[PDB]
Amino acid sequence: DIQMTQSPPYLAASPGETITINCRASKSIRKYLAWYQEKPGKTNKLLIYSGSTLQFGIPSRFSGSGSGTEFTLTISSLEPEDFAMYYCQQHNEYPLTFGAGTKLELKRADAAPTVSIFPPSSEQLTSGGASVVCFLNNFYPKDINVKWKIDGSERQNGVLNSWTDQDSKDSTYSMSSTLTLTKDEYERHNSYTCEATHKTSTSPIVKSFNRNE
């Protein structure tokens, strides 16, 4: 099997700029490399095949080149609809194989997350469970660490996170962190703390509450 490495895995850029992305093959695929564009709610769209042949209907701002082992795709002047996922595929040999993708993201201005923390609701408590929820909303860029502290001590277990995709309106990211305890474990402690670490600041954004008031 020939394996395929795309780089970079993420690339931030702006409208009107030019980017170029890479595809490498573990052995020679002669000139036979295609590119697909993937967008949410749309079927995958062939862009280029045979290394540099533009597919019917595809605008000339896309181009590609390469042979043997190294291939690139260039977009000449990014347009808003070009921020998307890109995959390459060799078409030289059985079995067909694909790269894992480069995600082209919309660059916007750095923004710090807005952080909110929520104690377990009384409904969840009467049933024995205790989830503490923390939202880190509307931030940019996407890298972020969240840390739970119970009475000053870092807690690692029972934490589930989820991340939205880049908002196609304001281009920010959002994230939820949920610490799930038993009601009993919840009641053994007083102080619950959510801390976000993000490049917009050398110091964490810390939100908490005391299980009383």
């Binding site: 000139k31 045979s50 042949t53 533009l54 019917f56 209907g57």
Partner: peptide, 14 residues
């Protein structure tokens, strides 16, 4: 017409 313009440029398909 647009198809044909692409069709003649891309030959041969190899």
């Amino acid at each position: 017409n647009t198809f044909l313009q692409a069709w003649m440029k891309i030959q041969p398909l190899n």
